[PDB]
Amino acid sequence: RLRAR
Amino acid sequence: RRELEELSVGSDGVLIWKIGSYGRRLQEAKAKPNLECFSPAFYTHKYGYKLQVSAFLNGNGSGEGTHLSLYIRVLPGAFDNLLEWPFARRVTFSLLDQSDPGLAKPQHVTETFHPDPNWKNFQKPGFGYPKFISHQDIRKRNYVRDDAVFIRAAVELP
Amino acid sequence: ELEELSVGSDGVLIWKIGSYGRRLQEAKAKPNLECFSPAFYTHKYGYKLQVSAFLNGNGSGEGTHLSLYIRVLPGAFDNLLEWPFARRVTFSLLDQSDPPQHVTETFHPDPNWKNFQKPGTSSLGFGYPKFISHQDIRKRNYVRDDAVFIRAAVELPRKIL
Amino acid sequence: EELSVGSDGVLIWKIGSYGRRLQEAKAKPNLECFSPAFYTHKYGYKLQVSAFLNGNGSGEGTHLSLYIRVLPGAFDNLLEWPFARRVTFSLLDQSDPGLAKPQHVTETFHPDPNWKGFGYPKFISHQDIRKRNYVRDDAVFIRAAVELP
């Protein structure tokens, strides 16, 4: 589910 | 005071971050689109990686306006030259259910990820969940209690 | 602007009371005078506790004994813990001889003692009015270089593996 | 807050600005750098490590010299004397352990029952300290490990 910002 | 931040070491690689004044800080986070709360910097283990957790009470990116967003990032640490790069230890976030563990086994909201070795911040000197928990879900159970929330970041030690 | 860094190693606080002679005289002069350890957490993210001592005694021990008490303080993490506080506590006045016989007492916290219940639901401390008599404390090396060491050990929850 | 430095106890002492301090030690002999005081363990011995970047005794001008000494500690009256714990010194090689296995410079000794400055006039020569990554980003890592019973 993992992501930047 | 920075020598205070150097004493900030995880307990079996665990940071527990209390965000107090939850009600108010959510209001400021609605009024200001890029309002980011920061955990103290902490070390994974005594002579290890320096990390910091950040949260957006009113969401960020795909979670903007609708969710709590939780991120973690690697910071420059004193002992970076003695460590393996890129940073590759598994990270687990939990928003804690603040119920008495003597009544029922509390239900934490929990997600876990492995750092992707292509993201720049995990290389030798934020990443996480834009939609960690929704505004509606966070009012269930005891995630918000006494106007504070507990964020836990646990870093798996080899 | 302070730490929160004050944690026991491990479940153990060692409290040094120096200037003992002078502090005993002050305690004789003012019977309501209570000495306090710094607050400490039993373990990282655990209970916040504090030890107190009456160098010239309190209640049943006044004028004749050292009195020793412990209390639960409001802690940052109280909502994540089991209440009432129920971990076994051990008090010791340390005999400062090169490795010595410590004076030691232990109790399991009273589940009805209002201070052992969850903080935030005026009073007060639990322990020993007559922990050690004035005569007993002059024995051995309980007082040395004009100081005493009080040790409070808390039984930490056991790890499940 | 310096009582707030209790450890495993392992101390890792970072000496930054190596070049400049080495220079100051060449120009000024018996120039001693000091580590922070640290506790071997919670409520235990207070120790301190010192270094001579340009050497001391048999090592002046040619070696780094490394010592450890006991400091008066608040809890000294509760401890066994003389100090008798095994002490290990290491100058760390700062290479990525996933990339190359670092070769640390290391010695271990049992305390001599006479003093507790105790250590190595010739811990590492200036020639060896310029190998590998002992000096990196103009800093060195000294590690002192004291074995707990």
Domain harbouring B37, CATH code:
2.60.210.10
* Residue for token pair 């505004």: B135
* CA-closest candidate to residue B134, choices B95, B98, B84, B102: B95
CB C99 within 8 A of CB D80: yes
- Provide the β-strand partners of residue C48: C41, C73
Domain region containing B93 = 1-158
Report the residue of chain D nearest C11, measured CA to CA: D42
Asked if the peptide bond before residue C84 counts as cis, ω within 30 degrees of 0, the response is yes
What are the strands, taking DSSP E only, across chain D?
Answer: 10-16, 33-34, 38-39, 46-52, 63-71, 87-91, 105-109, 118-125, 139-146
D101: Cβ contacts below 8 Å, ≥ 6 apart:
D95
Task: Enter the resolution in angstroms.
Answer: 2.5
User: What is the 3 state secondary structure string of chain B?
Assistant: CHHHHCCCECCCCEEEEEEECHHHHHHHHHHCCCCCEECCCEECCCCCCEEEEEEECCCCHHHCCCEEEEEEEEECCCCHHHCCCCCCCCEEEEECCCCCCCCCCCCCEEEEECCCCCCHHHCCCCEEEEEEEECCHHHCCCCCECCEEEEEEEECCC
Method: X-ray
Residue C148 in contact with residue C142, Cβ under 8 Å?
A: yes
Residues of B in contact with C81 (CB under 8 A): 101
Burial-class residue A1 by CB neighbours within 10 Å (0-12, 13-18, 19+): exposed
Q: Between the CA atoms of C137, C141, C145 and C148, what dihedral angle is there, to the nearest 10 degrees?
A: -50
Chain B: nearest CA to C153, how far in angstroms? 20
Tokens of C134: 């004035």
Two structure tokens written together for C43 = 């373990």
Residue C88 backbone class (left: φ over 0; alpha: ψ -120 to 50; beta: rest): beta
| b/e B73-85 (16+ beta carbons within 10 angstroms → b) | bbeebebbbbbeb
Q: Which two tokens stand for residue B122?
A: 């995990």
Domain count, chain D: 1
Question: D80, C98 in Cβ contact below 8 A?
Answer: yes
- What chain A residue is nearest to B91 in terms of C-alpha separation? A2
User: D9, D39, D48, D38: which is closest to D149 by C-alpha?
Assistant: D9
Going from the C-alpha of C59 to that of each of B151, C26, C131, the distances in angstroms are 44, 17, 12
Residue D52: strand pairing partners: D65
D80 touches chain C (CB under 8 A): yes
Q: Find, among C115, C17, C101, the residue nearest to C66 by Cα.
A: C17
Asked if C20 and C146 count as a contact pair (C-beta separation under 8 A), the reply is yes
Preceding amide of D9 cis, omega within 30: yes
